[PDB]
Swiss-Prot record, chain A:
Glycyl lysine isopeptide (Lys-Gly) (interchain with G-Cter in SUMO2) cross-link site: K50
Subcellular location: Cytoplasm, Cytosol; Cytoplasm; Endoplasmic reticulum
Name of the protein this chain belongs to: Large ribosomal subunit protein eL34
Function: Component of the large ribosomal subunit. The ribosome is a large ribonucleoprotein complex responsible for the synthesis of proteins in the cell.
The family this protein is said to belong to: Belongs to the eukaryotic ribosomal protein eL34 family.
Segment of the intact protein contained: 59 to 115 of 117
Top-level taxon in the UniProt lineage: Eukaryota
Gene: RPL34
Assembly and binders: Component of the large ribosomal subunit.
Source organism per UniProt: Homo sapiens (Human)
From Swiss-Prot, chain B:
Domain notes: The N-terminal beta-like import receptor binding (BIB) domain mediates interaction with IPO5, IPO7, KPNB1 and TNPO1.
Positions of modified residues (Phosphothreonine): T7
PTM description: N-terminus is methylated by METTL11A/NTM1.
Similarity comment: family membership: Belongs to the universal ribosomal protein uL23 family.
Upper lineage: Eukaryota, Metazoa, Chordata, Craniata, Vertebrata
UniProt-recorded name of the protein: Large ribosomal subunit protein uL23
Comp. bias intervals (Basic residues): 1-29
Subunit structure: Component of the large ribosomal subunit. Interacts with LYAR and GNL2. Interacts with MDM2; this interaction may promote MDM2-mediated p53/TP53 polyubiquitination. Directly interacts (via BIB domain) with IPO5, IPO7, KPNB1 and TNPO1; these interactions are involved in RPL23A nuclear import for the assembly of ribosomal subunits. Interacts with IPO8.
GO cellular component annotations of the record: cytoplasm; cytosol; cytosolic large ribosomal subunit; cytosolic ribosome; extracellular exosome; nucleolus; nucleus
Keyword Nucleotidyltransferase tagged: no
The keyword Ribonucleoprotein belongs to this UniProt entry's keyword annotation: yes
Chain intervals for the UniProt region annotation (Beta-like import receptor binding (BIB) domain): 1-36
UniProt entry keywords in alphabetical sequence: Acetylation, Citrullination, Cytoplasm, Isopeptide bond, Methylation, Nucleus, Phosphoprotein, Ribonucleoprotein, Ribosomal protein, RNA-binding, rRNA-binding, Ubl conjugation
Swiss-Prot record, chain C:
Similarity comment: family membership: Belongs to the universal ribosomal protein uL2 family.
GO biological process terms, semicolon-separated: cytoplasmic translation; translation
Residues modified to (3S)-3-hydroxyhistidine: H215
Gene (name only): RPL8
Protein name according to UniProt: Large ribosomal subunit protein uL2
Swiss-Prot record, chain D:
Protein's organism: Homo sapiens (Human)
Main location: cytoplasm
Modified positions (N6-acetyllysine) in chain numbering: K6, K69, K189
Name assigned to this protein: Large ribosomal subunit protein eL8
Disulfide bonds: none
Amino acid sequence: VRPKVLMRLSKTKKHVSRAYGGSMCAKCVRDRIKRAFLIEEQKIVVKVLKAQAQSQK
Amino acid sequence: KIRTSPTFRRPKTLRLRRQPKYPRKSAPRRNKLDHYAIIKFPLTTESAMKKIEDNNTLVFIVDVKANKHQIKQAVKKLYDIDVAKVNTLIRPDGEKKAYVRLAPDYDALDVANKIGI
Amino acid sequence: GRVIRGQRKGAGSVFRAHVKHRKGAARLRAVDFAERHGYIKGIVKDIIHDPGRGAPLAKVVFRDPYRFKKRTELFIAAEGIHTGQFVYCGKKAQLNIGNVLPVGTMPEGTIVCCLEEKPGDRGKLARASGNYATVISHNPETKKTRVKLPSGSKKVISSANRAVVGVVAGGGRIDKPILKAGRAYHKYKAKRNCWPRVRGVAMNPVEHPFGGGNHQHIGKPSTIRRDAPAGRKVGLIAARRTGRLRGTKTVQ
Amino acid sequence: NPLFEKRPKNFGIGQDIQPKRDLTRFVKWPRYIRLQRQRAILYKRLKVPPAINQFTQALDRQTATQLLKLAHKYRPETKQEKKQRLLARAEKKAAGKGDVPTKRPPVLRAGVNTVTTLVENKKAQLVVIAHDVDPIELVVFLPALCRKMGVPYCIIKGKARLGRLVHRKTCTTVAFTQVNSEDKGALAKLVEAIRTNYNDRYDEIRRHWGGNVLGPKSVARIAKLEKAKAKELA
RNA sequence: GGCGCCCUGGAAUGGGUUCGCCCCGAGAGAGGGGCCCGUGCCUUGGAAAGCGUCGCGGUUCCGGCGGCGUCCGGUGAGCUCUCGCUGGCCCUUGAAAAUCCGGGGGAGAGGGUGUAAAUCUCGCGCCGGGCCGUACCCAUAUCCGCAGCAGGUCUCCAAG
RNA sequence: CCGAGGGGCUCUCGCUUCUGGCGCCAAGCGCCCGCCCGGCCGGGCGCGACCCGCUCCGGGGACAGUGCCAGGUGGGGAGU
Ligand SMILES: [Mg+2]
């Protein structure tokens, strides 16, 4: 609808029950969840592979 | 002290209250436009007369500085009657015409009788 | 007695530029502690198009180091970038295409566009579509390097002039003919009010120093001194030679 | 104990947002601030003439506190005690008609225009002179003049402080004419400590130029070139 | 009507589709679902009013009184309007802002129970919405051209 | 440099680079009052986030500029 009529509706007709409800497209939510997961873990991998490098040089 | 911003914005200083020690006009001027000066005279043409019995509305001609809240109390306090709604108009002789509709508790054809027409 | 077309363009009434639908002044980000001492990670969001410019622009967002905010810059889009590319900016940025890093750190013979002509200027030299500048011959004491501008004029500049690596996107733009008068109307509709250029011979002696006569001729020599007054500088201004070219330039 | 954890913030480039640090140098001042600060620099950078440079050589605070202790009981008359002083003269004249009740009320004078009259008549015995006169030509002649009439002078720090002696704001000079003879021995105590420092040194304090030191960011690169010249030789 | 939305599953002997294209292992075809627009139809409004027609009252106010009707279908490169899908063009990329909304965060807040708190963008209910314009012409006669001047003057609607 | 557990003629800095993600409004430590009779709440300060200093940081710099005068040039313009 128009912008000012969004004041008349209720927030059941304006978003979706996911996180990032009426903002994101649900398939980049699916990718933002995987993108945050797979690269917070590799900064644990790159931390510990660096951490065993001072101790065995 | 530390200055966490590179902006030096000027301090909020104290602003006193204007409490003067003599009035500048010595007396509140009176309202020239009161509830008599609002409503000059009623309009008694043929079209206004058949809007009295047909529509429960009586018609005046009102001073042009008067809005509809001022009219609605001015007919209520002069003529001791309830007013439903008011519709104004500037008729091109230059004076404001007001179409005062009454509440259905009252009648227009006898309130017009006690004001003369 | 009447003033001429070349004089009226400085008054700026109907000759002001058409700056409505442009997307902004495309300038590199202002330098601070991050670009003096490290690198900053910025991701290019989009590739946009200024009307009246033939280089495309690229808008990059950067995580703001001082307030929790993101803020958006506009760079001249160096060629070969794509959206969703991380663009690194600072002294210790790694020498890749599209990254921007001071000319004292990149080695000689690299290819640079949009370089600052003085440190902090947010990018002035070699900006138009297809151009590039080459760095040569650093000087580590009295820190100052020279470059090779798109006119072939080599110019010694400061060593900390920040500059984006690569050549400007939109190259080859002048290879296609305009090919008709109507597409030259649309070319200059977006830029200025300069396109239909009436020959000064074709007009009356009030309006140009060459016009008049019963034959369309110049009459007087067309090459003028440089201290000629305003309204007499028409024609070939302060020419070192004329005629069809022999060689390339052969004079510094 | 159960759950609480350290979770520090990396504050290098490209990590967590920098905290609210001091920034009291890098802050855009008003143009009355940096006008007020750049001339304190610019008295230190120009070649200051020795006539202006008589100042910046003031008293040390141990002497200056002894001096204000001496000048404290020679305080001038205020309008509060001027009311009663004209009473006590008039109630006793109404009762006894004293031919001379007080032979010597002593006091210190105030004012440049009054002091200059005392020094060139040699009536003053010690001339306290201020430091921070805003048109410094109001005072610049007076150290050169107390040498010639031989009156001892001392530059004190701060024209606000000797202004409070005379119940005013700034008073730029005071003078000592008639001290009490029982307390001459405190005025004579520090007067050789003073005309050691000002009057006897006049051949040298008139020669001493001022200012002309480069800023610390530019004298540091002077030293770094000299250490490179020092590393060249050895 | 549309979906560049989802699930199962995996396609070459390639297939599916358009007027044109286009589409598919980054998931075709096929099967089942989901949201969006729903200006179309039914329903509430709503038959009481509107009109058509027949008939009888009332000097007069009469938004009189009553009978019956206001029904089925078809077709289209039709015309106008509108919504959508898809392309083409450009050294042409085809406005700003107020306003309104959704999300990310989680400082805080709330009654403490076999009782009810903070809060509520749900369903009702209550009061108010001032001021200025509003007639008429819009022109071979209400405008401008000295005039009821073959001139000039911006648009929307449109049948056989 | 030499060399013995080590010193420093000399130094470099360092804490973010496979990916269209996130990031602020302190965790933690040390202390101190009102608070519990060697225990519990309610607040504040410091470190974390180094100290000092004369320009905000750069680039120019006694030139450029500007003021007055002097000489060139001057149908750009004026008058005839
Ligand atoms: Mg031409």
